[PDB]
Design a binder for this molecule. Structure first.
Ligand SMILES: Nc1nc2c(ncn2[C@@H]2O[C@H](COP(=O)(O)OP(=O)(O)O)[C@@H](O)[C@H]2O)c(=O)[nH]1
Length: 615
């Protein structure tokens, strides 16, 4: 750190660590930080490479977070529990890692655990993920006796003298392993051969290739998404972490290896953005932490150019200008202030005030391109009611704390009526008198609201119109079917009457309200429900029970498609049916299934559903 720090785009390693709950994602992160060393983004150094560890969403399912996290990072280290082989979230992260094309390597953690087995991992990877693993190391001892590791690419072994990580020594491959080892070396050379003509010829000739040669070939296959080097160890016992770190520099990609980010031009034509430090700056904000003692920290990833300390940058997705006060780099133990952050690098910036997650930041006379609160797409309303995306983009609303998820219904009429509101009273408040006659009528779906005043000859005193409208306005917030907002109607005030001294503003507000409660009740009202658009990812083995579930959930299948080794089914299913789904889709596809849905349209609840809802 600091002393003799080097840059180079080629020496950068922006990685993420993906894993199923309990696989050991954090414990390996802790160890990695502990080893390199002697926040949305922590940085460290290993063999002259800056490794930036981007923190990944713990809830492997929150697409917005997962989607974005895959864009800021360049390589992933998928961690497996060596006694479970591929697991649910692992498969999910896997498909995720593909829909975004992020090179990866795997780490079979927990080799010390009772039940641990490298082959269980390799096989399940091969079958569920449909991944081509490459065995790069072989264990020595097993379970309670695991205690060394064999580098089959280099044919070297390492033994660990304690569970503390303070005793490591290179040793000769034990005789009892020399052949399994010789076997895997060849399998590996064989694979490398698929990526370098030169290695095949030598393989064929019985010549042993150079480790530089092999490494490169595997690195190439890996960056190409062809193979998936597999490593193993025990984060908890301090066996294998350094070897894992060497692999990150050897095979994960640099910002130069992966392909250009693309963002849309100010007019609309998407252009690709190469990581050139000397070209227009363009950065993307991916996380906004509020430091308990430095304040709003904005974490960014720089795609092009150089962001310099104390400069003016332009947030293009907000049109605002911002001032970059300081630039920071989080480390294991400690922060470091920097003067600049060049392309392909990441850090935190102090000084932004209107920049929220997902915002693009181009500089001075840099072209305005768009690359895409902490946020979660929420919205507060009112007794609180925190509407949200799931469980326009906010059709499921919970209220306060206890209040269970409710589906945002709406109501309307189908037949135009011509009603009449009337208020007559002898309240303490003198004599109240209001009387309006209106014509309500249906408007095309989504047309909103339209109020027309058609009163002639001051039949209703001009000072009261605003009040009949405030009345109408209020009544509409709670239709008489199930009590949800009334929409898509056009009301025309066309007659009524008043009393010279009895009329009043409230008398006319009430009568506005009433005329409307009737209008809706008498215009053959309907309930409109949100129709979500879902995308269920199912291993084609289960692709029959699933579709069936959809159709039972008043769904309507659109199309199929393949996500490599799985099938993705698009459909429109009432959000009211999609309740609990996740819990019953796991069951339907043995946890190996996952969907994501987006509000699509509003449409009328079928008479039947209506009668149910109504009661
Ligand atoms: N035996 C053993 N347990 C491990 C190992 N790595 C992680 N664990 C245990 O797995 C549990 C959860 O892992 P953890 O890193 O803490 O969080 P995570 O990503 O959700 O897994 C903890 O009890 C760890 O102590 C390992 O190498 N060996």
């Amino acid at each position: 750190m600091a002393v003799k720090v080097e840059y180079d785009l080629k020496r950068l390693r922006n990685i993420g660590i993906a894993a199923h709950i309990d696989a050991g994602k954090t414990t390996t992160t802790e160890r990695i930080l502990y080893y390199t060393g002697r926040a949305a983004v922590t940085t460290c150094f290993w063999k002259d490479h800056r490794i930036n560890i981007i923190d990944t969403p713990g809830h492997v399912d929150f697409t917005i977070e997962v989607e974005r996290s895959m864009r800021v990072l360049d390589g992933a280290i998928v961690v497996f529990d060596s006694s479970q082989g591929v697991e649910p979230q692992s498969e999910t992260v896997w498909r995720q890692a593909e829909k975004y094309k992020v090179p990866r390597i795997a780490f079979a953690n927990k080799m010390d655990k009772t039940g641990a087995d490298l082959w269980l991992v390799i096989r399940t990877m091969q079958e569920r993920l449909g991944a081509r693993p490459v065995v790069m190391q072989l264990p020595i001892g097993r379970e309670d006796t695991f205690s060394g590791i064999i580098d089959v690419l280099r044919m070297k072994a390492y033994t660990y003298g304690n569970d503390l990580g303070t005793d490591i020594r290179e040793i000769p491959i034990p005789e009892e392993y020399l052949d399994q080892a010789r076997e895997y070396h060849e399998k590996l050379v064989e694979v490398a051969a698929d990526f370098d003509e030169n290695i095949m010829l030598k393989y064929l000739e019985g010549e042993e290739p150079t480790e530089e040669e092999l490494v490169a070939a595997i690195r190439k296959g890996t960056i190409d998404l062809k193979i998936t080097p597999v490593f193993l160890g025990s984060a908890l016992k301090n066996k294998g972490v350094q070897l894992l770190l060497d692999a990150v520099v050897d095979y994960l990609p640099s910002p130069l290896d992966i392909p250009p980010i693309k963002g849309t031009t100010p007019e609309g034509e998407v252009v690709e953005i190469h990581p050139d430090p000397n070209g227009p700056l363009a950065a993307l904000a991916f996380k906004i932490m509020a430091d308990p003692y430095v304040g709003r920290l904005t974490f960014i990833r720089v795609y092009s150019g150089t962001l310099t300390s104390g400069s003016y940058v332009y947030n293009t997705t907000k049109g605002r200008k911002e001032r970059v006060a300081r630039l920071l780099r989080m480390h294991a133990n400690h922060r470091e202030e920097v003067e600049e952050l060049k392309a392909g690098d990441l850090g935190a910036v102090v000084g932004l005030k209107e920049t929220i997650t997902g915002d693009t930041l181009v500089g001075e006379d840099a072209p305005r391109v768009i690359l895409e609160e902490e946020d979660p797409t929420f919205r507060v309303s009112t007794q609180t009611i925190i509407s949200g995306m799931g469980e326009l983009k906010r059709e499921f609303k919970v209220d306060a704390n206890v209040g269970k998820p409710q589906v945002a219904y709406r109501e309307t009429i189908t037949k135009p009526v011509d009603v009449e509101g009337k208020f007559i009273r002898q309240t303490g408040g003198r004599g109240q008198y209001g009387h309006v006659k209106i014509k309500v009528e249906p408007l095309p779906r989504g047309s909103g609201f339209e109020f027309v005043n058609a009163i002639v000859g001051g039949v209703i005193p001009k000072e009261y119109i605003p009040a009949v409208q405030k009345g109408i306005e209020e009544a509409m917030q709670s239709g008489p079917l199930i009590g949800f907002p009334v929409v898509d109607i056009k009301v025309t005030l066309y007659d009524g009457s008043y009393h010279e001294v009895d009329s009043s503003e409230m008398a006319f507000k009430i009568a506005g309200s009433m005329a409307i409660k009737e209008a809706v009740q008498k215009g053959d009202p309907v309930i409109l429900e949100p129709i979500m658009r879902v995308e269920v990812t199912t291993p084609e083995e289960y692709m029959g029970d699933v579709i069936g579930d959809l159709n039972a959930r008043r769904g309507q299948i659109l199309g199929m498609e393949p996500r490599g080794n799985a099938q993705v089914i698009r459909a429109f299913v009432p959000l009211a049916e999609m309740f609990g789904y996740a819990t019953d889709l796991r069951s339907k596809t043995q946890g190996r299934g996952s969907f994501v849905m987006f509000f699509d349209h509003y449409q009328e609840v079928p008479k039947q559903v209506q009668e149910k809802l109504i009661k």
